[PDB]
Amino acid sequence: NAEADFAASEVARMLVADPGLCYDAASLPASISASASYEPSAAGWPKADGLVSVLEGGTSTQRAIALEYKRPQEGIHGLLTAIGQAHGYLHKGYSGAAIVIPGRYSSHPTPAEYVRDVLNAISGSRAIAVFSYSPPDTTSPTPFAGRIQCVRPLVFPKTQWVHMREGSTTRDAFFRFLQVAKRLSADPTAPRPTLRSELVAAIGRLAPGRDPIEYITNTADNKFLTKVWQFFWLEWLATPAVLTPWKLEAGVYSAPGARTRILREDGTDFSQLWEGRVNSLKETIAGMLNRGEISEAQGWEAFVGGISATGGGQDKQGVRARAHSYREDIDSALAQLRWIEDDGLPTDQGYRFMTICERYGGANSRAAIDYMGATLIQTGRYASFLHYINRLSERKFAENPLAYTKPGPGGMPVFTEESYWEYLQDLETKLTDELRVMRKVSGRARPRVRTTFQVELTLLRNYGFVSSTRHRLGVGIPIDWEQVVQALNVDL
Amino acid sequence: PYDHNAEADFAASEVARMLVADPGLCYDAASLPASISASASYEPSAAGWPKADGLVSVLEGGTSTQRAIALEYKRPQEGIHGLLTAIGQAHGYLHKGYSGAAIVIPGRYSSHPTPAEYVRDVLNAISGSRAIAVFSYSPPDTTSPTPFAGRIQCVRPLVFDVHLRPANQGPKTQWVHMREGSTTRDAFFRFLQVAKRLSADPTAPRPTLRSELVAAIGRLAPGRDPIEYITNTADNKFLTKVWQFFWLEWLATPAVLTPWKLEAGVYSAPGARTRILREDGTDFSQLWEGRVNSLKETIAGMLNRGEISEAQGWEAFVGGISATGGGQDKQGVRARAHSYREDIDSALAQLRWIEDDGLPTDQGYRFMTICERYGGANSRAAIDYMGATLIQTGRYASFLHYINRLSERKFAENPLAYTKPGPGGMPVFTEESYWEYLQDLETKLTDELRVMRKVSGRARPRVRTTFQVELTLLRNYGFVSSTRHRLGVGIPIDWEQVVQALNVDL
Amino acid sequence: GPKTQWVHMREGSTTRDAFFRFLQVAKRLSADPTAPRPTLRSELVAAIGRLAPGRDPIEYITNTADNKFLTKVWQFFWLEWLATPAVLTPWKLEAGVYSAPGARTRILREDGTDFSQLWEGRVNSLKETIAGMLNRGEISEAQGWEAFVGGISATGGGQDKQGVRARAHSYREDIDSALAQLRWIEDDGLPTDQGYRFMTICERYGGANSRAAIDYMGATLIQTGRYASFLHYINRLSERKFAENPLAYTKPGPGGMPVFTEESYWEYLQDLETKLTDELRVMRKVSGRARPRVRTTFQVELTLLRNYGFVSSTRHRLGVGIPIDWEQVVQALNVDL
Amino acid sequence: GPKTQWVHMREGSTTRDAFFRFLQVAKRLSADPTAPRPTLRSELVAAIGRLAPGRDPIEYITNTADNKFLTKVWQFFWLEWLATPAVLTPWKLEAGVYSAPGARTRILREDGTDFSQLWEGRVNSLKETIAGMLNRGEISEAQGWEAFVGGISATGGGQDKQGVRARAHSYREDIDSALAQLRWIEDDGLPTDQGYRFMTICERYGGANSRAAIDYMGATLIQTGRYASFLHYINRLSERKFAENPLAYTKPGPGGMPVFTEESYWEYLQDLETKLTDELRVMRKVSGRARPRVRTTFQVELTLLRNYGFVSSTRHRLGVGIPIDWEQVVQALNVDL
DNA sequence: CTTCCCACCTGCGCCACGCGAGG
DNA sequence: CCTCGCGTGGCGCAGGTGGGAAG
DNA sequence: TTCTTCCCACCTGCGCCA
DNA sequence: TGGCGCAGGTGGGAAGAA
DNA sequence: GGCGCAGGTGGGAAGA
DNA sequence: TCTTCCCACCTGCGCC
DNA sequence: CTTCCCACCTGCGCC
DNA sequence: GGCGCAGGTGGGAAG
Ligand SMILES: [Ca+2]
Ligand SMILES: [Ca+2]
């Protein structure tokens, strides 16, 4: 008959004692007045047997929480009915609801825990609370005094495939970076490398109070990834031989022409930095030194910090600036391929690549080529790029198989290079503005521009997924689908 | 059948057909599949407390993304209060690990004529779950094979969101439930054969009984289907039909269902056996006769003494005979059929030999192939396959590991743990020590490890010794030595055969 | 004489429902090895006795010799699903005139339109010709019954007609080969694990025309049926012709814009077939029949690939030849049956 | 046909690190065959010249012969990890008496307490004896360097001392046999896929003493090495003996209760050894050299099964004999080694 | 005469649904 | 006419018992 | 308004082997 | 000689074009 | 200011 | 002899 | 004072 | 006589 009234009174007396469950910690009122009452017959379709009215310190505050009492006679099936009844109370226009349930059941040991889990993981609402009570003592005037305990309170743009660079994300770079990471994880107490006396002097002159090694590697951190990057940079790319700015033979300064320890993709020789062309950071400095415009100390400072544009050109960059560009495009490539974790530790696939390279000839070997190509296709999501371009090309060439062709010598249509470039531009516009699966920013108004899909098409051509002939009259880009099929079941 | 469980299957079939017709009911506009295939199925018996009326299984063009939509059918009989309960159990099925949940409520109620609109308004403003679909149905015509055809509309669609392992509602036995005489190998073989013969070309007309049996069923159960009464079935599922065709064809055959014999004017027992072989292979099994206190013998004795007539005997043959204080109430055909079906189907489902909907799986078909090729369920190949399945799919290997670990832990601290003085000073491992050791093992497995389930005791002169069926099966299949106990170890497991049967790749 | 290196499937015989029902019959008869026999009607046995005395009517009308498990499955499939008693009615004598009964088999058409017809689909069919001969008075009822199972020889040059025996032979020897090549039945005739998987899919998701059954059949054709090998051959021999010359078969009809025509399509297909059957020795080809019409080069493979989505419906492009859809071919290769 | 039916291991030679570093050296040298030969000391080359007049200074300190990939990796491992330049110094005090340097190699020990160590640590060691006779003037510094590579004669009761060459031969044969029987290296010496898996887990999870390396070693000992067959044999024979009498070999105790004493354990193990040797012809046995001490029956096998967890630490029990733990054995028996 | 095993017998817990008393 | 209160269908799975058979 | 042309569901019957 | 394993024909709908 | 990734330019090679 | 085209080596740009 | 284990030692047969 | 593979022995820990 009249049993939920005692539970409602107990909850009302508890709410004032513990404002934390009724109100959030951000705006918890100092004083709250709580009373118990029964809903009017016109309140709504649900009966709303009892409700506790709570008010904050202010005069205009007013909230009502309709509570639901489920006796153990209902069983474990009353838990589900209680959840539904709480939702109806909120829909009727109440501020909140309370599910008062026994602490334990004959078959269910943790009813309140289950109800709270249901309300959290699925309902996603914070306006209904759960109160599990100990068995009451009918003799006492207030059987639920101290029996009710709270359980759950209530509250009253992206490229979409792996970023790779033509000259900075070679196979040997990945191999040696992973090897250095593994060796440094094996021996965390490895000693920091050393820099030349002239190099550290120039670094100090350029920037006072800066770490010579943290400066030449373009890092501001001490994490594991920073450490392995520093070791790789100062051991494989920026070797002591490479870091020699000039040669002082016979009184005339000439670039030493020293190469690094990272093999080129073609395998003809090793890679180079700051040397090899008519203009290079290690050759303009030598030319200036022979001319006499700068001193040897100024030469070291220019080598570390670069050379300004001097008008109408790209300002040449030194070791510090090139370090950031090299670092942030081999880190991002490995992260996107998921060959390293977030902390910077090689994964199972990174260890598999290292194992393939060590067991077989090297990074420039057939097994390593196959593994890297399959990783690019599957994990690098180059298959998505191939599917996109194939779909767009087919939908453009089905309407007209001579879409971009030009008249030939005798009038026979021919797929010239201008047609290829405008077709690629249309593909780029479709992939950027319409499909929105490529982040792209314009700028750099320069005498020369760069080919659309330069690195992607270069890598695809090198790995064999597209034909050596870069275009055809009908298909457009001649995708080799047998190779893609073979690479799509490698199961790395 | 049940007036509620009959319409749930029809509603599930109609909802599956509706989802097939319009793939956008359960999917989104952006990710709309080209087309999907949907079927109706039921929750497995051993899966969680919250039990739904059924689930629609959806398979899209990926051929691997199989989903499940736990249904909740409602009837006008349970007033208007059933809407809140339906919402509650819908959230429960969502917590159970189901992608969707579809309320199947009626569209017309006495209080207000807009139940579905209210359900959506409650769901879309407070529940905030897009995986709860709402259907409103019109009074079906229960006189056609498709009563719900065209009378259900999807008022509110759903958007899809596993790991239903815990089911924290008390301890549950972790190995497969097997029995000594009811749940046997040949019963499994014949049940699977019936299921496979009924799946191909379904809707076989019916089984039939005798005129006297039908008259008795009508006399002691007016207005009930004789087949459903004599088989203790209350549904139209595929597995229910398989059980109906298996009970009255292999076990309760017309020869078996003959209670008495009127030779020389004195009632007797026909001496008729079923068509199911025994695990021994000596002779076919028996039902309701073969002992002094059996049901057929008791009925014949009552008839001879003149206590009851032919009509009362026929009624008692299917309704059983009560006990006047001393003894246990005798069991008729209906209750024994219930017991047999629930021992066999639970074991078949736990062994993963029949799917959730009822069709046999690949392992069930492999068992049928072995039995039919090698000459029955008692052949050596069938025995090996059954033992390996019991070890692997049934958690009998886990049971052996548990008991071996507990026995080793007990006997490492103190050898001669339970022994008693023998002829001289040499201790012996007598039967009392064996029973005490088994009781201690059971207490450890139940109270502390929470692996087994124990209910109560019947307070009868016999006691149902601790590991009765499990140890019998292990001894017969060779995973436990024939000598039941040993002083040093306790239960002498043969680990060579356990590891031989642990890797057969069935 | 090399054998064709992919599954032999026809267009109206080896459909998705015929396989399902044949496998269902085999599965049902595996649990009932002592199935007595199918049945005929008295006129049929009288006609068979008149034609071939001392021969079993069941094995004569089904065109079978032994009594093995596979022969039993065919006997129970022919006379119960295709040559049903309704189908085996040759005419409908109403108001003194005869006409085609209009009976259909119990096998679906593989497109959901209706059930497949047998011997009376259109004019000039067996039943229509028999009814016309009966109306004209050329033959009697007994001769009509004999012709219904023996067939009518060619009146002029033309082509002969097929009775129930010959059609049964063709259907049986083109369905058993397809089922054996897909590894859906064993050597003895018992269904394999993949046959049972197909059974379960069809019986669970609503028949052989459901999406799941279509996906399973397409994956089986690509992987087990070696249709992916055929697609690879076609693609590798096609890209080798449009790379040397992207205008191989232009047929410059319009004055300035060449267009790929149907004659160019047939020339390209003939070149592909010649390369496949002579240079590669993969296909098997037989001497043709001097007839007013001929079947195309790849009549059934191309339409099977077109229906399942592996080849575009337009079947035409100037530069690509046969447009293959490699997104669906790759997806169908990861089904892992 | 006497031939032991399990992998041949030893307590201190075939350790986890002695395999990890050996395989690492093999992998490193396979990727660069043109590598400089290891460099010895100066007088160490002279002493060999005194010992042998024509032997190579590296092919003599390693007992190697001819030339092969296996010989090269063995020499590199021996001179880089075991016979390190620091270890190869016999006396390093030179103050008022020549003491023992206490040099430890770079090979960790199984218990992980400290690095391994040869020819030092106990009174009856090679270096301590040489230092003793060099402080007393019994030999010369040149004679001491010669004896450090040749080995002192008996000069005592029954046995001789071993130098560096003979110890190198013993270590080489032990490691080579334990690696070839485990199928961790090829016949030519190249590591297999299992060896590379071992190297990967050792390098990735913190050396050969980590939990992953221990688990892999136990798994490959149970599966690839026929230790499971040995465990099955001993368990079957123990159960056969104890079924007849569950109180076999026992002796009266304090209150008359039977007890499994050490003598009972030794005679039970001796009976097992006799059954495995002279009855099943599984083991291989030889003479005992007639020495005051004798190695126990199953010394290396039981030690490995005990420290890897397949046999309880308490080496015996009353009614079972050897308390084999079958949960761990079963768990390790299903592992892709 | 007593106790164990195995093929037979036997029904306890508990959820979910339905009908009805009280308000 | 809503809400529980109580009954029960059905379901799943766990608990007895007679006769051979050894001791 | 009528003549072709391709395509599927519905028809034939080589061609080798015992 | 016939059975076995595949291969090679036609007839009406839809279309496109004159 | 550091970090994600975009955007250039020499110089063989291959021809007009 | 002059024009492009690709690759390997080289440059900064929007954004907490 | 005695015994056992496990790192460090030591030769045994046989082609 | 070199290889594949068996056999001892000191010092700590526990009784
Ligand atoms: Ca209430
Ligand atoms: Ca319901």
Residue numbers in the entry:
A (entry chain A): 6 to 161, 175 to 510
B (entry chain D): 2 to 162, 166 to 510
C (entry chain B), D (entry chain C): 174 to 510
Publication excerpt:
Type IIS restriction endonucleases (the topic of this study) combine independently folded target recognition (‘TRD’) and endonuclease (‘EN’) domains within a single protein chain, cleaving DNA at one or both sides of their target site. Here, we report biochemical analyses and high-resolution crystallographic and CryoEM structures (in the presence and absence of bound DNA) of the Type IIS REase PaqCI. It forms a tetramer in solution in both the absence and presence of bound DNA, recognizes a longer target than FokI (5′-CACCTGC-3′), and cleaves each strand of bound DNA much closer to the bound target site (4 and 8 bases downstream, respectively). The enzyme displays a similar tetrameric organization of target recognition domains in the absence or presence of bound substrate, with a significant repositioning of endonuclease domains in a trapped DNA-bound complex that is poised to deliver the first of a series of double-strand breaks.
A 50 bp double-stranded DNA construct containing the enzyme's target site and sufficient downstream duplex to extend past the enzyme's cleavage site was used to generate a DNA-bound enzyme complex in the presence of calcium (which facilitates the formation of a productive cleavage complex but inhibits cleavage). A CryoEM density map of the DNA-bound enzyme, corresponding to approximately 3.0–3.6 Å resolution, was generated from 1,291 micrographs and over 800 000 particles. All four TRDs within the PaqCI tetramer are individually engaged with four corresponding double-stranded DNA duplexes through contacts with the enzyme's target site sequence to form a complex to cleave a single DNA duplex. The binding of DNA imparts minimal rearrangement of the TRD tetrameric assembly. In the DNA-bound complex, all four endonuclease domains (ENs) have dissociated from their original positions, where they were originally sequestered against their corresponding target recognition domains (TRDs). Two of the ENs, extending from one of the two enzyme dimers in the protein tetramer, have reformed a catalytic EN dimer around the cleavage site of one of the bound DNA duplexes (indicated by boxes in all panels of Figure 4 and in Figure 6). The other EN domain (colored green) is engaged with the opposing strand of the same cleavage site in trans (i.e. that domain extends across the dimer interface from a TRD bound to a different DNA duplex and target site). The cis-acting EN domain is positioned appropriately for cleavage of the phosphodiester located 4 bp from the target site, while the trans-acting EN domain (which has moved a much longer distance to re-establish contact with its partner) is positioned appropriately to cleave the phosphodiester bond 8 bp from the target site on the opposing strand. The opposing two EN domains (also previously packed against their own TRDs in the DNA-free apo-enzyme), which are also released from their TRDs as a result of DNA binding, are unobservable and appear to be disordered.
